[PDB]
Write a protein that binds this ligand. Structure first.
Ligand code: NAD
Ligand code: NAD
Ligand code: NAD
Ligand code: NAD
Lengths: 317, 317, 317, 317
């Protein structure tokens, strides 16, 4: 029996609404927009429903406040969060969003425990780890969207320097989705050409590369300070959809995301940004980049950053 | 010389941002997001830029507050308006938005007078007429988005009754974008089958048809009541993109929109919702539907309702 | 468990290869190209495989001569046929292609009896009926591609007259895929406007309409006489894919195709061209067009044509 | 003035027809299918025209034998060649195809001298050089399709070893389109990970890499041996479309193709397979890969192999 693909979006704010919009536009799946706030998901679902005929999609998009409606969901995308943008650090939402995810975990565990779960809620890496422990879902079926967003920014900034199509830039950001984030310059290439060659050719300087690395790391504030009323939401939505595509279409796509890293990068069992292979069984493998001694040290510092915020959460009131 | 297609979006609020997102996603054109509000268009443009590599698009999307940047725009889409949603009627925003469109008119006249202009700002039909007068652009290069949204809603509700793909429903809403809009039930077909045949076959009643007609006319309120923060914006954005597509691709597509009707539907020279043919020369034609006497009268009421609001604008302080 | 969608293409000639190409391009499913001819499916599958990375699709396309490889197929598309184009009538291939379908029926019945089967092999309507009887598959899970091709031609010719987008022309061809084919002029509309109105407006004559009807009926020879080495294959392939999409995505799409018509159009249980609704359960409903007395008579003549060729087959050597 | 994009396809055989099909499907441009063979281009154009409404495209596709019809073409793609496949080497077709391209050269020079020309006719690199000389078009507006096909094969085979999405493999083939082609294994990465790292990790051996390199170079024979009626045509068609896209959309895309290399890879002014940047001005740049000494030598052999065949053409009867 052919059953329609089904994606549950938990939290129908800025990011949640865009996800439903894009999923519906692509006819990737039916969408269930869940929110505790009255009217909002229903209003967005009705609005998006009207656009479906315009896009030529037969996707159904509905709004709900009832976890029963997410039963049979193939993918669950968690965007739920307490109000207000972070001032200086994504960790400011730690305590509130952890409690939200406790509730979301009970909903998923009861109504769709076989779903592939993509966490978006900040602070991403710690939230992903929290959700996995509380929900009890397999490690390979729970991950966090971050790397795709960070790497896309990294790739975009490199592409903007050289004036080329960003799709032809290969570039990875790894580690935690925070200031300790590691854009791995060593394995950057533009159509096969490494950055070291472009330096010799006089087309880019090491200082320009450092500026691009810094830009990647602080990119979230650049967007947030301009929007004023919140953080980025167009690209993070698109990124979550790319991850859902990889699972639903069994792409074996290489996806940088927050995944349970057990026998790679010198860590013994932690959720952090790593290049994964995603397919019909969720996170199916992790790829090991060729890191320089400096990059290994920077990754080490990112890991400490993650563990620090995680311990703070473990000692929450 | 091959040149990139360019779409200027005047007003980077709810609808404007979504237009930029979708246009970018489809790689239909480069986008210039214009707004007077500080930060907003810049923030959205940067966020949407980060998503382009995720979508595999090379569209550039920039934010600005300078009309010089809309220079050489192939299409201009106007979403600019005063804040706050309408409580009962779209006409409450009349005088404020008229002042705004004067600024846009002088901007377009100076920097891109050959552009195809699609107005979205409410009250739609009067705003379109106003923009054409002040800007001095050809009647065929200036129209308003409404019919696509209204017809899409009409098609969606018919499709939901019969349980079929809305894309296989043909249906038009004509007249002004307001309570007086005419969902032409005589124009309706589902896979070639007219509503009269469905009544005879006992697959729909006249009461159900009346309900669908009513639903269409007040659909905006159903969305707005649930959103709380404002009016519909996912579907209106998509509708504008469909109209921009018809122009940029020279589709010769049937597009219900607010266009200068000079010798059809028993009017002499007025902007109202009619089925047009849109291609590379803007509004290239208007189709004459086979309206019943009741529908002709309903359309007459709509025309007067439009003329009423238009005269009030002519008698300004 | 997410399993990839799988389409089996039985016969890897002109049409079969294009189907695999388009399915792969769209990433609609994995494709199995089956043929008894050595090398051909394998060569086409390898060639098409190389194009997948270019299209950004992860679809797997393989060639085979083994029916075991079509097990678990969601859709089976039958293109298998004896060599050579028909001279004057599609019925010339009757006896040979019936025997091929006996063999194909055994393959499907054994390895994928729950598949949605779309027959393409000519003479279409009789071949569809033959396959259903020999295979023993449910009537709603076996249909023939024809109406989509015939209607697309009908729509295209109307659209070419008016100089508009063919997607905005609603037009149906019903009955058997042969000379008795019935393009139903009565229910043609262009953006809501019926042909009767265009006649009054002086934009089309009844003689031009008759020419378009004739063109639709003899369209196959116009293509075949130009190609010389065979019959049409680009559009029939595309048409089969549209039908596969409707099933796999549960579109509830209105699809004119050869379906088992039991309580409609005055027939008591025959495969002929009718507007169907297709979804995850195959042919889920049949729509009844509003036919004129003349059109009812023409349909009657088409039905006789179908029954005549069917009786000939029943008395085969 | 908005004008439709126009692509002329010179030669409506296996590849030419597929190009028209895909270009139409994507609504990338209008297509003119040119051929001297009677009926063929007309038959394919009509067949493909019928599919346009199925794809929701408004692209026009016409067939012709008159060069006046390629007037105003933005892109010209040359597939014209003498019949019969190569047995061992692509160079067997040298003199025949050279005569053909003289006709095409004079046609393009007369009717669309500002066109971007993509040659496909074998022997590719020599034919490209020949067409440029005879036609007198700028070096940057004339290139050949080969690298995209060779690189796509290379990427596909690497991806199949690692079991990942080929789109996430970066890999280049450079030099002439023949046995001397250089799959640059030093350029290869899979999600940022180079082959050297995969060897160290025990996920691939050097022998397996050597096999992949060999597979790439003789991939054309594997397809041709299985097709029997001719050489590959699904993937070569798709490759040409990707190149046309880069030009028409001004992508600034990294495209390995046969381009006029004047001051890179240690050559003075020759057409050979190199990574280019393609945008609205044709070949806008050439990237310099970080080749090993072995790869530099292999490339040197390829350059001579190309020069050999080129000199034979210069010494015609
Ligand atoms: N991982 C990343 O790269 C990344 C990028 C950007 C934003 N984010 C994060 O994503 C989250 C969402 O961002 P946003 O802009 O959509 O926020 P938002 O405030 O617009 O939306 C949050 C929504 O969650 C809902 N909600 C609150 N409590 C809930 C509960 N218990 N159950 C269900 N829903 C609940 C709210 O009603 C609201 O609609 C934030 O935590 C943000 O920091 C992450
Ligand atoms: N035609 C339809 O069917 C339809 C449907 C929905 C909404 N609308 C209308 O579309 C308009 C926009 O809706 P929205 O939700 O995007 O509103 P919004 O408030 O989110 O956006 C309006 C934007 O216009 C900007 N603006 C204000 N003054 C300006 C000026 N002088 N120049 C340039 N920009 C200026 C604001 O900064 C704001 O960003 C409204 O008038 C609404 O009623 C029409
Ligand atoms: N329904 C329609 O609208 C429509 C339109 C066009 C063509 N057609 C029909 O579709 C059929 C295929 O057309 P085509 O151009 O692809 O023909 P083709 O000759 O190019 O391909 C037929 C293929 O079937 C294979 N074949 C033969 N016997 C077989 C068997 N027992 N099992 C499996 N495969 C076998 C052959 O090897 C060949 O590759 C023809 O009957 C044609 O008349 C139908
Ligand atoms: N670059 C690559 O990687 C690559 C890959 C595959 C094939 N090819 C080459 O592409 C070419 C075409 O392949 P195909 O399979 O389409 O061949 P084909 O024989 O199917 O098509 C060639 C067409 O050219 C036409 N033609 C002959 N003389 C002509 C003239 N003077 N003007 C215009 N048209 C003329 C023929 O009528 C025929 O339709 C071949 O040379 C082949 O070797 C190149």
């Amino acid at each position: 029996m052919i059953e329609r693909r089904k994606i549950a979006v938990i939290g129908s704010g800025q990011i949640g609404g865009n996800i439903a919009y894009i999923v519906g536009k692509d006819n990737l799946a039916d969408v269930v927009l869940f929110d505790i706030a009255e009217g909002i998901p229903q209003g967005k679902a009705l609005d998006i429903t009207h656009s479906m005929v315009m896009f030529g999609s037969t996707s159904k998009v509905i709004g709900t406040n009832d976890y029963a409606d997410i039963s049979g969901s193939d993918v669950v995308i968690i965007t739920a969060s307490i109000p207000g943008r972070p001032k200086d650090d994504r960790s400011e939402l730690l305590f509130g969003n952890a409690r939200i995810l406790d509730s979301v975990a009970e909903g998923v565990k009861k109504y769709c425990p076989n779903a592939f779960v993509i966490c978006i809620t900040n602070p991403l890496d710690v939230m992903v780890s929290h959700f996995q422990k509380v929900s009890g879902l397999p490690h390979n079926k729970v991950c966090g969207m971050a790397g795709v967003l960070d790497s896309s920014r990294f790739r975009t900034f490199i592409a903007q320097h050289f004036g080329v199509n960003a799709s032809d830039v290969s570039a990875n950001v790894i580690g935690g989705h925070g200031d300790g984030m590691v854009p791995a310059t060593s394995s950057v290439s533009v159509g096969g050409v490494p950055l070291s060659s472009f330096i010799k050719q006089g087309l880019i300087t090491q200082e320009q590369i450092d500026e691009i690395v810094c830009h990647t790391r602080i990119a979230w504030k650049e967007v947030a300070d301009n929007l004023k009323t919140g953080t980025a939401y167009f690209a993070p939505a698109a990124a979550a959809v790319k991850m859902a595509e990889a699972y639903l279409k069994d792409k074996k796509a290489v996806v940088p995301c927050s995944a349970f890293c057990s026998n790679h990068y010198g860590v013994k069992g932690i959720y952090m940004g790593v290049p994964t292979i995603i397919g019909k069984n969720g996170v199916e493998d992790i790829l090991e980049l060729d890191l320089t001694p400096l990059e290994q040290k920077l990754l080490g510092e990112s890991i400490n950053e993650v563990n620090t915020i995680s311990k703070v959460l473990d000692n929450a009131p």
